[PDB]
Write an enzyme that holds these catalytic residues in place. Structure first.
Site, PDB file in Angstrom:
ATOM      1  N   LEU A   4      52.842  16.543 -10.404  1.00 22.91           N
ATOM      2  CA  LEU A   4      53.576  17.390 -11.329  1.00 22.91           C
ATOM      3  C   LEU A   4      52.649  18.446 -11.926  1.00 22.91           C
ATOM      4  O   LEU A   4      51.424  18.393 -11.791  1.00 22.91           O
ATOM      5  CB  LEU A   4      54.230  16.561 -12.435  1.00 22.91           C
ATOM      6  CG  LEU A   4      53.411  16.031 -13.611  1.00 22.91           C
ATOM      7  CD1 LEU A   4      54.349  15.712 -14.754  1.00 22.91           C
ATOM      8  CD2 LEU A   4      52.620  14.790 -13.246  1.00 22.91           C
ATOM      9  N   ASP A   5      53.255  19.413 -12.604  1.00 23.71           N
ATOM     10  CA  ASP A   5      52.545  20.616 -13.005  1.00 23.71           C
ATOM     11  C   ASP A   5      51.679  20.371 -14.231  1.00 23.71           C
ATOM     12  O   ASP A   5      51.959  19.495 -15.052  1.00 23.71           O
ATOM     13  CB  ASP A   5      53.532  21.742 -13.303  1.00 23.71           C
ATOM     14  CG  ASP A   5      54.304  22.169 -12.080  1.00 23.71           C
ATOM     15  OD1 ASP A   5      53.772  22.020 -10.960  1.00 23.71           O
ATOM     16  OD2 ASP A   5      55.446  22.648 -12.236  1.00 23.71           O
TER      17      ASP A   5
END
Ligand code: PC1
Lengths: 87, 65, 60, 459, 176, 165, 73, 56, 68, 171, 128, 119, 59, 52
Positions: A41-42
């Site tokens: 995920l970011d």
């Protein structure tokens, strides 16, 4: 008026509000599992998670920390640094 | 005993403090209703405000030439 | 010898002693003199504190 | 009064022929006994002052100042340890005997018959304080401070002697009684202006006024605690006392030539309150506080109302006690940390809890505590100067605001906000400091109860 | 303005802008539901021209973002009641007595508290024993003459506690 | 005013100390039926502000504005009292709505309690004072002024007009 | 120090304001909310508040009856 | 009235005891809040009288 | 366990000083107040009479208070 | 003990109570309980003290003075004359201060007795206050702090000389 | 879209729109690294001298001593009398003095001539 | 009222103006209407310690009100009839003042505009 | 019981003793604002009524 | 600008007062004479109100 915390309960509440979040799974949800390593995920969404932590616990964590949490174990460790509940 | 904590729920209540709270708001309501009827008349404080003075010439003493 | 015998003893010494400026004396003297002047009809504190008949004014 | 002079001559060889660890208790005890003995002084009544001898006479201007001097001695004599305990026994005896000799010339100065004797004992007061601050100054410019002190006080106080001999050979003897009876107006010549400027300028230098106050900060940052408290309290209020006595003569020209001293006093009071608002070196803040309060004293002298004189002597005694207390607080801070600065030692609400009570009480007494003697003095001076001029109340109240301001900042810089958590060498609050503070402030509150003593001869 | 490095990053500047914009947006927007709406709106606004590989255009549009952000700031932000400038900010500093003290009690009070004082004594012996040789061998040998960081390596090799531990481990609780 | 805002500060401080020192209208909203005693207290307070007719706060403020409009006044100060009475009505409504009625916004691990005999007796006795004591004080005092008491239209009703608008 | 853990997967969001924000978010073309982070704020003993005129009208339940009885008395 | 002046002066003077009491304590109090609360209540029950005597 | 180690700075020196202060004021707080009590309740203050006809008093016998 | 002919008071206009009440009267019960529980201990203690005063007698005496002649009868130097004359003058100054104090106290008492009827029953006392303060403002005021007596004598001569010039011009 | 937020000596300029945090060439990177090395050396020396268990006294900061000695004693050197400094001194010292002197002239002449006329408000003016 | 705006935006003659209210001498249009009863008995008015700016008409009603309030002190709600009687008497005094106001208004308006538009 | 007894009686006793004797022998001490008498009243001590006010009518 | 506006409207109010259709107060006895400044024998003056 000050109820003291516990290590297991704060780990449970952190994993709880992580499990509330959308783009991860409740299947393999480990405290000892990083973010860029397996979840992918970011970093943007990582600091969104940091903001969720702060909005649960009501204090800022600073920027030089905010690079280097990366996993729920160190999250629980740093909030244990702040509140300092070590029975 | 005293309070117990809970996590993301509607809190518990004793019947005592809620019945005193309802009692106090109800006594305000009772007092303002018994107050509003018994003596006042606060919009007109027991007086009809009469006209501007009489709306009359030729009266109270003026000369019309 | 700084508190138990100096401080409280000096406190009771200065708490009452014969009055400076003869103060209560001045009170009782003023009461007597005002009762005198109001008994003899004339106004209290007659001005011109020295005798104007007993003055020698250098004229112009 | 001779029975007050002669036990001080007996108190000097006490220090010499008492032995090791025996000088201290004997000197402290017996000087406290002298404080009792001249607490017995106040016989003064009614029409005149208490007047005994060709040698002696005492006003009720001289009475509270003399009681203040003899009360301030043993407090100080206890206050000046911890910086000469490691010094020699002989040098310690020399120190204590120098203090006793200085007290003796102070009493000589306060009970002078003729003003020549006042001048002799005035510069006799001047001389040993030099020796005290120079032999134990404990900072590298005690040289410069003592040099400035002696040169300003002599060279301002020098034509005073000439003018006193001139008043001697123009109007008979110089005793204050007959001069009170043989005054006559000396009108606007120019020689009258020079003579008035000589006498008033000498005591101006002693106050100091704003024009040459520059010796006074160095003389309090570069002095030990004993010479500092003697210097500030007794010497500056002695200068005020001397101006109070000499100002009885030369009445007719003070309306002509008293305007610019009022001016320099008021504007320098405002500027002094400005300059102490910002400076570091905490010890100096009390010195500029003293400059501000004595500028107020000088305004009170040069306006010539009995209200003004009573407020003047009240402010004298009150600032003497307050400044001596606050000097000893700064000495306690300097014993804790070896700094003398202002921003280093911080915290001290946690540490030393009842020391905070004394800092609060001292900043209250600087702050014009509402029944204190300080407020009585400032208030009656404002009353008399508003009688004197209806517009000067602006500067008085601006002084009041800034006075409250710097006193409060002096409080909260040191004893408010954060302990610096690296100092870790302060000892706990000694019983000595708290004992000295109970010796300072209980008499101030007792005089705050019944202040009919501390009001002057125009009571 | 940071202990370890000297400059943040470009991405770290963008990230701090995102955190402060999210905080100021919290302070701007009540009722939390339209706040979640506008938060997804701002997340999409960063999704607009995120993935470009330019440098000069990236920093230029970041500057224009800073301009329109300093316009779009809320003037009295809801900072938490632990932040500097907030509501507590060492609220309980009245009872934050430092730990170098408490040696200067009268020993009657030491007879009041035997066990804690004996254990503090063995803490102090642990402090003094593991102090000079190994810790100062690290801090005098293991870096370069220029330290060039405010961090420190632990006692990673063999023995005692990691260096300079005392006034960071032994600290008050921040909450009595 | 003394009885009034003594009770008001005490109520709001009870809320803030019971809810982890947040104190801010940001993250405050839904506290209706979160413990009802201080909610009753705060609504009696902020309703008695501007004088809901006719209570203790009616008497003081409204005889003030009646004597103000019936005087040789500034003709600008009356407009100041007009607009500011409307403004204190609107932030009274705002402080009620943002204090109690919205969604409950404050984090989890709650400390929602106000059980205290001391606090309930304090709030108790001061709201009981806030009901009666203003009328009791206003009645048995000699009128040291001439009361105006003779007003035209929109000069005695005008307080109620401003508060309702 | 126990809590008994009122668990996850309880909400299934269902809260009509979050329903509307998922409507506008999908119609805008994002399809990624935060989650069910407000449903505990949105029901329970919750999901209704009093009206603001109900704040004034919270008192008549004992008020009207006692008032009319006192007027008759 | 001796009653009236006496009660007003004791409403003054009953707020003087607790400060000098704890300054003369040299012990460890517990219920000093209770002491201050009951003496403020005592001050109120004294001061309720002279207003009634006044308007009477 | 529940009660942690509270950290107060020191109290012994301050309580020693205030103990000594109250004890060494109490040493002559009780007898002086009791003595002035016995004076103004037993020996009496004075009376209001005048100088009689052709009589000389001392420099005392002018003052209301007997210790004065 | 005080002379009421030098400390004047209007007599006790004491209104009789009149109820017309059936509560009845908590304050009457309260003042009788106050008398029963306060006055008799005070009376017992004061009576014991009065007997202990009645044991023996002390006497304070007013110091009485002659009249040393004058300051105007002293010459230009006369050092054993000026001292007596001016200390007698200083005692006149202080007793005149207390005269002004007494009259101003009477003004305060007249204010407080009449309540708000300030323009009633305070006519003669206000007038004598203005009279004594006009004499004081004209006689002791504007001279300075180092008065001995001679500044006041110079003020006196200059005042009557100014009035002599005034009546010489106006006649 | 914005007036670029003009700064003053009172109103500070925030750290976002510097704009010196944009074209950070390797010279300025090197300068920031050198400044970091400075602060690192200072805090390393401090933490060496600070955590010693045998140490008792104070830390003795020479920077604070340097600031104090510069602020108090090291003013009088170095001094040169400039004409601008002298005129600014004679304006900030004598200007308000002669200003209040003129107003005391004014008020005292008015009051003394008014009481020489005798028309004061001395109905009773005792407490002079 | 808006008559204040009528004065501020019209003329200044016929609009009567405060703090200069006695303009014309009395009984200018009426023949002989004056009683001025004043049975308040000035010495009793002094002896009852009222307040200044209350030594006016209708004072006897205020005397009765003070007397019943003193004579029934624990009766807390007693004096309401005499209270409203005093209210009514001061209300009628206010009516008399307002009638004097608009009488002056109509006097100056009618007479001044008649003779000063045709003279 | 004895606690409230001393803390409400003893200052009352001391001040009520103080406020009678010494402070009323000081002459110009505490003074009233005079009680109010009405035309329907009478004097307690001397004793005479005040002749009341005349007719009211047209109230 | 806000300060100047408020003080300007204050001065405009100071030239434009409020007044109401009410006459003055007809004090009964020579406008409270002998309870104003006094003069018990100097100047009694004949002035009376007429009923309207
Ligand atoms: C500062 C200088 C103070 C000089 C001492 C005071 C003095 O006598 O000044 C007057 C002196 C000289 O004045 P003088 O006193 O010689 O003036 C003559 C005065 N009669 C006629 C009364 C004798 O001033 C100076 O010496 C100025 C320097």
């Amino acid at each position: 008026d000050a109820p003291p915390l516990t290590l297991e309960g704060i780990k449970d509440r952190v994993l709880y509000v992580l499990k509330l979040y959308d783009k991860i799974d409740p299947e393999k949800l480990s405290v000892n599992s990083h973010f860029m390593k397996d979840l992918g995920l970011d970093s943007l969404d990582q600091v969104e998670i940091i903001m969720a932590m702060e909005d649960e616990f009501g204090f800022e964590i600073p920027d030089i920390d905010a690079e280097k949490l990366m996993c729920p174990q160190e999250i629980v460790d740093y909030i244990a640094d702040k509140k300092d509940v070590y029975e | 005993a005293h309070i117990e904590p809970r996590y993301r729920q509607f809190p518990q209540l004793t019947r005592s403090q809620v019945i005193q709270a309802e009692f106090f708001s109800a006594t305000m309501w009772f007092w303002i209703l018994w107050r509003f009827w018994h003596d006042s008349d606060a919009v007109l404080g027991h007086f009809p405000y009469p006209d501007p003075s009489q709306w009359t010439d030729e009266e109270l003493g003026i000369p019309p030439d | 010898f700084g508190f138990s015998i100096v401080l409280v003893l000096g406190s009771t010494f200065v708490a009452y002693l014969p009055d400076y400026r003869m103060q209560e004396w001045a009170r009782r003297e003023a009461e007597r003199l005002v009762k005198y002047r109001e008994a003899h009809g004339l106004p209290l504190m007659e001005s011109n504190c020295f005798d104007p008949s007993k003055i020698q004014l250098p004229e112009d | 009064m001779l029975k007050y002079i002669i036990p001080t001559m007996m108190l000097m060889p006490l220090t010499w022929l008492s032995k090791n660890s025996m000088i201290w208790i004997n000197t402290t005890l017996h000087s406290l006994l002298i404080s009792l003995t001249s607490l017995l002084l106040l016989n003064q009544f009614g029409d005149n002052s208490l007047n005994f001898s060709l040698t002696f006479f005492s006003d009720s201007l001289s009475t509270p100042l003399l009681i203040l001097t003899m009360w301030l001695l043993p407090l100080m004599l206890m206050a000046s340890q911890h910086h000469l305990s490691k010094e020699n026994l002989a040098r310690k005896k020399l120190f204590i005997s120098m203090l006793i000799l200085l007290q003796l010339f102070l009493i000589m100065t306060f009970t002078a018959t003729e003003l020549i004797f006042f001048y002799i004992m005035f510069e006799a007061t001047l001389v040993p304080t030099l020796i005290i601050i120079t032999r134990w100054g404990n900072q590298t410019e005690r040289l410069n401070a003592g040099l400035y002190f002696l040169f300003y006080t002599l060279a301002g106080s020098l034509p005073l002697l000439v003018a006193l001999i001139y008043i001697q050979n123009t109007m008979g003897s110089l005793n204050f009684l007959i001069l009170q009876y043989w005054v006559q107006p000396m009108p606007n010549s120019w020689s009258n202006t020079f003579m008035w400027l000589a006498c008033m300028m000498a005591f101006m230098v002693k106050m100091p006024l704003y024009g040459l106050h520059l010796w006074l900060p160095k003389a309090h940052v570069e002095a030990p605690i004993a010479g500092s408290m003697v210097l500030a309290a007794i010497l500056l209020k002695l200068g005020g006392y001397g101006m109070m006595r000499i100002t009885l003569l030369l009445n007719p020209i003070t309306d002509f030539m008293a305007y610019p001293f009022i001016m320099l006093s008021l504007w320098g009071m405002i500027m002094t309150s400005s300059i102490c608002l910002r400076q570091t070196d905490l010890k100096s803040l009390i010195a500029y506080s003293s400059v501000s309060h004595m500028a107020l004293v000088i305004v009170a002298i040069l306006i010539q109302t009995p209200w003004s004189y009573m407020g003047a002597t009240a402010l004298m005694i009150a600032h003497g006690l307050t400044s001596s207390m606050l000097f000893c607080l700064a000495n306690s801070n300097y014993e804790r940390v070896h700094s003398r600065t202002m921003i280093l030692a911080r915290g001290l609400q946690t540490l030393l809890p009842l020391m905070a009570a004394w800092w609060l009480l001292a900043s209250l007494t600087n702050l014009a505590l509402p029944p204190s003697i300080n407020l009585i003095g400032e208030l009656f001076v404002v009353m008399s100067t508003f009688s004197w001029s209806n517009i000067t109340i602006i500067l008085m109240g601006l002084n009041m605001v800034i006075t409250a301001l710097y006193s409060l900042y002096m409080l909260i810089t040191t004893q408010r906000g954060k302990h610096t958590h690296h100092i870790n060498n302060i000892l706990p609050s000694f019983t000595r400091e708290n004992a000295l503070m109970s010796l300072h402030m209980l008499p101030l509150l007792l005089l705050s109860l019944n202040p009919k003593i501390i009001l002057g001869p125009l009571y | 303005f940071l202990p370890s490095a000297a400059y943040l990053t470009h991405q770290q500047k963008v990230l701090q802008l995102y955190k402060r914009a999210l905080r100021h947006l919290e302070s701007r927007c009540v009722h939390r539901d339209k706040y979640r709406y506008f938060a997804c709106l701002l997340r999409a606004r960063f999704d607009e021209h995120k993935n470009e590989k330019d440098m000069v255009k990236a920093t230029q549009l970041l500057r224009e973002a800073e301009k329109e952000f300093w316009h779009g700031q809320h003037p009295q932000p809801y900072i938490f009641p632990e932040s500097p400038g907030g509501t507590s900010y060492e609220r309980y500093e009245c009872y934050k007595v430092p730990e170098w003290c408490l040696d200067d009690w009268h020993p009657s009070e030491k007879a009041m508290y035997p066990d804690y004082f004996a254990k503090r004594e063995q803490w102090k012996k642990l402090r003094r024993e593991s102090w000079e040789r190994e810790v100062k061998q690290l801090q005098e040998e293991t870096p370069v003459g220029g330290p060039r960081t405010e961090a420190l390596p632990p006692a990673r090799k063999q023995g005692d506690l990691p260096p300079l531990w005392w006034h960071i481990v032994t600290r008050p609780r921040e909450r009595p | 005013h003394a009885f009034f805002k003594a009770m008001l500060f005490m109520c709001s401080g009870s809320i803030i100390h019971s809810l982890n020192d947040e104190q801010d209208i940001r993250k405050m909203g839904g506290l209706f039926k979160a413990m009802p005693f201080t909610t009753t207290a705060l609504i009696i307070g902020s309703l008695a502000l501007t004088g809901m007719p006719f209570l203790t706060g009616f008497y003081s403020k409204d005889l003030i504005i009646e004597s103000a409009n019936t005087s040789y006044t500034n003709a600008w100060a009356l407009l100041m009292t007009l607009v500011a009475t409307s403004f204190t009505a609107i932030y009274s409504t705002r402080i009620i709505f943002f204090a109690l009625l919205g969604q409950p916004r404050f984090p989890t691990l709650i400390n929602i309690n106000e059980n205290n005999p001391f606090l309930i007796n304090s709030i108790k006795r001061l709201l009981i004072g806030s009901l009666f004591a203003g009328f009791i004080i206003s009645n048995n005092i000699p009128p040291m002024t001439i009361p105006q008491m003779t007003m035209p239209h929109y000069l005695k009703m005008t307080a109620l007009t401003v508060t309702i608008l | 120090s126990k809590m008994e853990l009122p668990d996850y997967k309880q909400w299934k969001i269902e809260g009509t304001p979050l329903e509307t924000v998922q409507e506008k978010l999908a119609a805008r073309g994002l399809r990624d909310p935060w989650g069910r982070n407000e449903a505990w704020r949105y029901m329970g003993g919750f999901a209704n508040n009093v009206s603001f005129v109900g704040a004034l009208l919270k008192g008549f339940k004992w008020g009207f009856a006692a008032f009319v009885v006192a007027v008759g008395a | 009235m001796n009653l009236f002046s006496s009660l007003t002066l004791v409403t003054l003077i009953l707020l003087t005891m607790p400060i000098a009491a704890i300054n003369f304590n040299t012990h460890k109090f517990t219920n000093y809040p209770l002491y201050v609360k009951t003496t403020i209540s005592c001050a109120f029950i004294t001061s309720m009288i002279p207003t009634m005597m006044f308007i009477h | 366990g529940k009660r942690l180690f509270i950290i107060k700075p020191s109290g012994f020196y301050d309580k020693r000083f205030l103990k000594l202060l109250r004890f060494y004021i109490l040493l002559t707080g009780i007898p002086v107040v009791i003595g002035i009590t016995l004076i103004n309740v037993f020996i009496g203050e004075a009376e209001l009479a005048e100088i009689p006809e052709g009589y000389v008093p001392e420099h005392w016998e002018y003052f209301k208070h007997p210790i004065s | 003990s005080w002379d009421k002919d030098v400390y004047p008071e209007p007599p006790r206009r004491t209104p009789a109570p009149s109820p017309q009440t059936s509560l009845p009267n908590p304050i009457t019960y309260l003042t009788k309980a106050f008398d029963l529980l306060v006055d008799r201990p005070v009376t017992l203690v004061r009576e014991f003290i009065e007997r202990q005063h009645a044991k023996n007698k002390y006497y304070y005496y007013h110091r009485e003075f002659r009249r040393v002649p004058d300051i105007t009868e002293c010459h230009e130097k006369d050092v054993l004359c000026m001292f007596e004359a001016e200390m007698q003058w200083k005692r006149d100054y202080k007793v005149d201060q207390e005269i002004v104090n007494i009259i101003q106290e009477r003004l305060k008492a007249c204010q407080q007795r009449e309540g708000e009827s300030h323009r009633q029953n305070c006519a003669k006392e206000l007038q004598q206050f203005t009279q004594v303060v006009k004499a004081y403002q004209d006689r002791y005021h504007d001279l300075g702090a180092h008065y001995s007596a001679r500044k006041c004598l110079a003020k006196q001569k200059q005042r009557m000389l100014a009035e002599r010039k005034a009546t010489k011009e106006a006649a | 879209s914005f007036p670029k937020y003009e700064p003053s000596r009172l109103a500070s300029l925030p750290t976002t729109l510097d704009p010196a945090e944009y074209d950070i060439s390797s010279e300025t990177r090197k300068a920031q690294a050198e400044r970091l090395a400075i602060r690192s050396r200072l805090k390393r020396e401090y933490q060496l001298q600070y955590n010693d268990p045998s140490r008792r006294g104070v830390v003795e900061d020479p920077a604070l001593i340097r600031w104090t000695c510069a602020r108090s004693a090291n003013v009088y050197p170095n001094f040169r009398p400039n004409t601008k400094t002298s005129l600014l001194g004679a304006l900030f010292g004598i200007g308000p003095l002669i200003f209040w002197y003129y107003v005391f002239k004014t008020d005292r002449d008015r009051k003394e001539k008014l009481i020489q006329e005798g028309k004061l408000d001395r109905t009773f003016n005792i407490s002079y | 009222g808006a008559h204040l705006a009528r004065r501020y935006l019209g003329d200044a003659s016929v609009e009567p103006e405060p703090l200069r209210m006695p303009t014309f001498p009395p009984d200018y249009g009426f023949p002989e209407r004056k009683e001025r009863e004043m049975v308040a008995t000035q010495q009793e008015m002094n002896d009852a310690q009222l307040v200044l700016q209350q030594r006016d008409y209708c004072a006897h009603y205020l005397i009765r009100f003070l007397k019943c309030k003193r004579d029934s002190f624990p009766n807390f709600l007693a004096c309401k009839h005499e209270q409203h009687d005093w209210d009514y008497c001061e209300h009628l005094d206010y009516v008399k003042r307002m009638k004097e106001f608009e009488r002056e208004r109509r006097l100056l308006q009618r007479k001044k505009r008649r003779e000063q538009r045709e003279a | 019981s004895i606690f409230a007894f001393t803390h409400v009686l003893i200052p009352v006793w001391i001040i009520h003793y103080y406020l009678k004797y010494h402070v009323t022998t000081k002459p110009y001490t505490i003074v009233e604002k005079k009680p109010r008498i009405f035309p329907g009243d009478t004097i307690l001590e001397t004793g005479e009524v005040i002749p009341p006010m005349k007719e009211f009518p047209d109230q | 600008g806000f300060v100047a506006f408020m003080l300007f409207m204050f001065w405009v109010g100071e030239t434009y007062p409020t007044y109401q259709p009410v006459g003055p107060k007809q004090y009964p006895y020579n406008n409270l004479y002998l309870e104003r400044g006094g003069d018990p024998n100097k100047e009694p003056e004949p002035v009376v109100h007429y009923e309207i």
